RNA sequence: GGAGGUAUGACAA
RNA sequence: GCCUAAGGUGGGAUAGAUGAUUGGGGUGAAGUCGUAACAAGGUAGCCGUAUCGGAAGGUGCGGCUGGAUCACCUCCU
RNA sequence: GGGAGACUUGAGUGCAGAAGAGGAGAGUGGAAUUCCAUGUGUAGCGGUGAAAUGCGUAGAUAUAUGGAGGAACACCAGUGGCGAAGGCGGCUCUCUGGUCUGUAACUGACGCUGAGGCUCGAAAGCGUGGGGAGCAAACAGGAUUAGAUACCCUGGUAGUCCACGCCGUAAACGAUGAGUGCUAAGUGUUGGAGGGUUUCCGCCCUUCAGUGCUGCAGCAAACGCAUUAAGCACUCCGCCUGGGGA
RNA sequence: CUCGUUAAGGAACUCGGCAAAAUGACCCCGUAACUUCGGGAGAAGGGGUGCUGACUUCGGUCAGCCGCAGUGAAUAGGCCCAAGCGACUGUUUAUCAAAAACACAGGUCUCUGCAAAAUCGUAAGAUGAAGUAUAGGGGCUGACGCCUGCCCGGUGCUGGAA
RNA sequence: AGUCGGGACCUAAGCCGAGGCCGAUAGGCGUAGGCGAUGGACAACAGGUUGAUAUUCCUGUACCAGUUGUUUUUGUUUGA
RNA sequence: CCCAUGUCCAGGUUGAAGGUGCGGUAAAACGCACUGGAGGACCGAACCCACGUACGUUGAAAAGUGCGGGGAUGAGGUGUG
């Protein structure tokens, strides 16, 4: 659940966090840890390409098994662990053959569940099946767009998609955004919804906490200089003073769509949203 | 459950064949109360059932008060056996 | 026969 | 030397008077605006609540008959 | 009144039965509305006291096949049932409260009321997150009008729905606190029980608990109430003391 | 220039109590409005402090002694009432501006179905992200509380397609 | 200076980069593979001595890696 | 500004969540103690900073010094690469 801190200090005032009740341990799997460096929004040229990123706490990457292509044997859920890299929690699972892996933790997952993957797996939270085998109306997550590539869609905490129907070699899906689109029927998905639904409700509370989470301050364009931002300049506070608000590089910032107009995936997107 | 009820009645019977008596009634009420407390925690919004639970609690309280007034030693024995206050 | 449901107009005289 | 009245200092508590200004309320034989209610009062009224409107008030939801007229059902005579 | 006993009628338990939209949770079915898609098809549709706004040749309305999604559960349905009250109506399952009737095995007055407290509490409203078909405050436009910040018409947001949490008020009404006993009848109806018949169905008699109607005694200012009292009595509680100001 | 003292007065100085003065440690008593119930608060306002005996439950207490004065020197908050602005801790013009400016947690709008959008780059290749709509980018507002009215004609954006 | 710090050890960020990708030229990018400590690994201390060095020289007492040789055990292809 | 890897923050103060005990109740909520040790928490050296003022202004100094001043477990300081 969400615990609210008493307003002992102005910084702590109105702050909330998770109790981490679901988390069963704090010792990740050594075999599955990998090193990660904080790119801080800088590409191979060393230029800042994405603003407002950098600093914050050190992290280790946990190798998640998005593919769920090990259908031979059952995987027993050993622990539910905190993952610094993603909003959702992960689950360490042991395959009966001794292979250890991490998966996303679906809502309602519990230690001891014996998950299975493959066409014949039953429709139970945490199981993985090709979309063709998942009955309509089912709630799923960790959907892959191409067979064997591994789950890409519906992975954030609390997210979920629903199977609407079949057609041809494609399966009709409503994604978490409300967009309805076709996805290749041989793509896999995990039954259920991503756990840690409460994540959205956390109140960060103070600037230092965002800095921990690797967000650097965001400076409004209206308080820059004209050579810095189209909104920059002007005496005193100023209105936008343009036809429409724009990003630092002149791209309109309200309502202007950016999806490529000749996207190949229009043929598969049935109903858009966002 | 009648079977559970009957076993409790035999356990707390003041004497052979004693269906009705402060001890038997209080013990049976206590088990119903515990079972119904679990139902209430499962169904927080079952207000109508909760009213019956309160009535059972009141009746059990009245029986305890009568028993204490009548034979304090039997009252002490019963509260110890049932783990009551 | 009965019963429950389906625009304005003082004041007193 | 202790005790201690009075006096001094201090922060509170409490009672009243007073105060630019302001709020609702009341009275005032013939002022202005409408006509909300009483008849089915001309959209039945009323209660709680919400919102809107110069004003009475309107509308929404729920509730009551302390509901006129009329057509059915069930009950009684 | 106290103390020591006894008792079973009140109260409760046991045992055997009865009914129910009682509550909570998870599912699920059909009609209808709206929207979406596609055929047919052409000039209206819709609406009023009468009109207009509006929708429609960018092909509407209608019509046929589908799809989506939301809310409410037609017929049954009945002064019918259930709940302390608010209230509860598709169906299924899970959990669960109460009530009623027998019986007389059990306890042996263990009961009634109940300030303060606690809990529950229509609708509207509020917070967080969802959902959003229809309806619809606010609001827009068309009307009506002297004016119309309304009634009428076309649209329409919050809300109505869900989860959790607040709120705590209603003509929350039978405008009638609870408990108990007693005081003519007649007649419906719900759930039982016993008997006398009846081949069974069913008819009759008795009886309990509801639920209506009519109506003596009695009560009342009158209207009226009248075994479901507002009659005759006892116990406890809440409440009233001219109107306004309030 | 740096420092010490200063009769009586005590802010009359001055743009302005600038500077200086004053407060300053520990222990005890005591402590308001307001409040988001955490604070406000070291509020305020007071009292004690040395040495020597006696007794102590070891912290005291009782008795006595000395001085103008006992944290005897040094090092240690001045306080209160009220208004504006900004919630707050932070950040800023290295070298005339530290602020009411920026940031901020929170709010909201909008883009983005993943070879995502965005950005660096001719490209390859990168960041975004070994992340996936409870995520990421952009615009505005800026804790919290109560709220956020009317206008879609014009300009943008979005949709439409005769 | 075998023992301290560095090299003959290891890797992070970053950098270079066979082939390779991309590109008017120049070149840009990058795989394998490398480089790169501020980190990991790693055997010696006490005293004395000079005008100037000392865990480096000297005295004492060690340790680490290895070579030769003597001796002692054990294995020689069902093989340590 | 950022990356990787080290390192620094005397000493005091306050007392969040949680936990235990005892009350309290049908069970609770709740109350009181104790425990516990949170914080862009408090006071204050080193450290970092640079608010006021005097002096300096061919300076001791091409930005400082004296007296005061703010932060001082963090959105912190700082070293190496
Ligand atoms: K805060
Ligand atoms: K996480
Ligand atoms: K900003
Ligand atoms: K400006
Ligand atoms: K009216
Ligand atoms: K039942
Ligand atoms: K709501
Ligand atoms: K009612
Ligand atoms: K009857
Ligand atoms: K009066
Ligand atoms: K003077
Ligand atoms: K103060
Ligand atoms: K003295
Ligand atoms: K001080
Ligand atoms: K500021
Ligand atoms: K701020
Ligand atoms: K403000
Ligand atoms: K400052
Ligand atoms: K600034
Ligand atoms: K605000
Ligand atoms: K934003
Ligand atoms: K703006
Ligand atoms: K923001
Ligand atoms: K406009
Ligand atoms: K426009
Ligand atoms: K060496
Ligand atoms: K080193
Ligand atoms: K200075
Ligand atoms: Mg950003
Ligand atoms: Mg500027
Ligand atoms: Mg420009
Ligand atoms: Mg401008
Ligand atoms: Mg201006
Ligand atoms: Mg009228
Ligand atoms: Mg009227
Ligand atoms: Mg009327
Ligand atoms: Mg209106
Ligand atoms: Mg409601
Ligand atoms: Mg309307
Ligand atoms: Mg009332
Ligand atoms: Mg009757
Ligand atoms: Mg003087
Ligand atoms: Mg003097
Ligand atoms: Mg002066
Ligand atoms: Mg002067
Ligand atoms: Mg000064
Ligand atoms: Mg001193
Ligand atoms: Mg500030
Ligand atoms: Mg500051
Ligand atoms: Mg400067
Ligand atoms: Mg300055
Ligand atoms: Mg601003
Ligand atoms: Mg070395
Ligand atoms: Mg290269
Ligand atoms: Mg080459
Ligand atoms: Mg070594
Ligand atoms: Mg030397
Ligand atoms: Mg601090
Ligand atoms: Mg330094
Ligand atoms: Mg600086
Ligand atoms: Mg401070
Ligand atoms: Mg400090």
PDB file of N, CA and C (backbone and C1' of nucleotides) and ligand atoms in Angstrom, chain F residues 86 88 90-91 99-103, ligand 15:
ATOM      1  P     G F  86       3.738  35.852  -4.866  1.00  0.00           P
ATOM      2  O5'   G F  86       4.853  34.778  -4.502  1.00  0.00           O
ATOM      3  C5'   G F  86       5.938  34.537  -5.380  1.00  0.00           C
ATOM      4  C4'   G F  86       7.053  33.790  -4.694  1.00  0.00           C
ATOM      5  C3'   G F  86       6.684  32.461  -4.067  1.00  0.00           C
ATOM      6  O3'   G F  86       6.622  31.411  -5.008  1.00  0.00           O
ATOM      7  C1'   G F  86       7.992  33.701  -2.556  1.00  0.00           C
ATOM      8  P     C F  88       9.615  29.316  -1.221  1.00  0.00           P
ATOM      9  O5'   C F  88      10.006  28.322  -0.047  1.00  0.00           O
ATOM     10  C5'   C F  88       9.807  28.685   1.308  1.00  0.00           C
ATOM     11  C4'   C F  88       9.883  27.487   2.213  1.00  0.00           C
ATOM     12  C3'   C F  88      11.227  26.792   2.260  1.00  0.00           C
ATOM     13  O3'   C F  88      12.130  27.457   3.122  1.00  0.00           O
ATOM     14  C1'   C F  88       9.533  25.187   1.981  1.00  0.00           C
ATOM     15  P     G F  90      18.916  26.493   2.162  1.00  0.00           P
ATOM     16  O5'   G F  90      19.401  25.365   1.158  1.00  0.00           O
ATOM     17  C5'   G F  90      20.095  25.697  -0.028  1.00  0.00           C
ATOM     18  C4'   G F  90      19.786  24.715  -1.124  1.00  0.00           C
ATOM     19  C3'   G F  90      20.211  25.155  -2.516  1.00  0.00           C
ATOM     20  O3'   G F  90      21.531  24.745  -2.806  1.00  0.00           O
ATOM     21  C1'   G F  90      17.928  24.593  -2.552  1.00  0.00           C
ATOM     22  P     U F  91      22.646  25.822  -3.207  1.00  0.00           P
ATOM     23  O5'   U F  91      22.222  26.288  -4.660  1.00  0.00           O
ATOM     24  C5'   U F  91      22.151  25.361  -5.726  1.00  0.00           C
ATOM     25  C4'   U F  91      21.693  26.039  -6.986  1.00  0.00           C
ATOM     26  C3'   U F  91      22.377  27.358  -7.276  1.00  0.00           C
ATOM     27  O3'   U F  91      23.622  27.179  -7.921  1.00  0.00           O
ATOM     28  C1'   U F  91      20.047  27.612  -7.510  1.00  0.00           C
ATOM     29  P     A F  99      19.467  37.887  -0.203  1.00  0.00           P
ATOM     30  O5'   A F  99      18.148  38.320  -0.973  1.00  0.00           O
ATOM     31  C5'   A F  99      17.410  37.372  -1.724  1.00  0.00           C
ATOM     32  C4'   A F  99      16.385  38.050  -2.593  1.00  0.00           C
ATOM     33  C3'   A F  99      15.332  37.146  -3.196  1.00  0.00           C
ATOM     34  O3'   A F  99      14.300  36.852  -2.278  1.00  0.00           O
ATOM     35  C1'   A F  99      16.174  38.581  -4.860  1.00  0.00           C
ATOM     36  P     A F 100      13.242  35.692  -2.587  1.00  0.00           P
ATOM     37  O5'   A F 100      12.104  36.439  -3.404  1.00  0.00           O
ATOM     38  C5'   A F 100      10.756  36.005  -3.323  1.00  0.00           C
ATOM     39  C4'   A F 100       9.912  36.611  -4.412  1.00  0.00           C
ATOM     40  C3'   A F 100      10.546  36.627  -5.806  1.00  0.00           C
ATOM     41  O3'   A F 100       9.543  36.363  -6.781  1.00  0.00           O
ATOM     42  C1'   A F 100       9.863  38.781  -5.236  1.00  0.00           C
ATOM     43  P     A F 101       9.699  35.140  -7.800  1.00  0.00           P
ATOM     44  O5'   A F 101      10.941  35.555  -8.695  1.00  0.00           O
ATOM     45  C5'   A F 101      10.772  36.265  -9.910  1.00  0.00           C
ATOM     46  C4'   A F 101      11.996  36.129 -10.769  1.00  0.00           C
ATOM     47  C3'   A F 101      12.450  34.697 -11.002  1.00  0.00           C
ATOM     48  O3'   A F 101      11.810  34.120 -12.122  1.00  0.00           O
ATOM     49  C1'   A F 101      14.257  35.942 -10.179  1.00  0.00           C
ATOM     50  P     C F 102      10.951  32.779 -11.971  1.00  0.00           P
ATOM     51  O5'   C F 102      11.997  31.626 -12.270  1.00  0.00           O
ATOM     52  C5'   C F 102      12.820  31.666 -13.422  1.00  0.00           C
ATOM     53  C4'   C F 102      13.955  30.692 -13.294  1.00  0.00           C
ATOM     54  C3'   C F 102      13.558  29.320 -12.779  1.00  0.00           C
ATOM     55  O3'   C F 102      13.138  28.461 -13.819  1.00  0.00           O
ATOM     56  C1'   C F 102      15.340  30.137 -11.487  1.00  0.00           C
ATOM     57  P     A F 103      11.909  27.463 -13.588  1.00  0.00           P
ATOM     58  O5'   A F 103      12.510  26.357 -12.621  1.00  0.00           O
ATOM     59  C5'   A F 103      13.619  25.572 -13.023  1.00  0.00           C
ATOM     60  C4'   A F 103      14.191  24.806 -11.863  1.00  0.00           C
ATOM     61  C3'   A F 103      13.196  23.933 -11.121  1.00  0.00           C
ATOM     62  O3'   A F 103      13.078  22.657 -11.713  1.00  0.00           O
ATOM     63  C1'   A F 103      14.405  25.252  -9.577  1.00  0.00           C
TER      64        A F 103
HETATM   65  K1  LIG I  15      11.957  33.024  -5.336  1.00  0.00           K
END
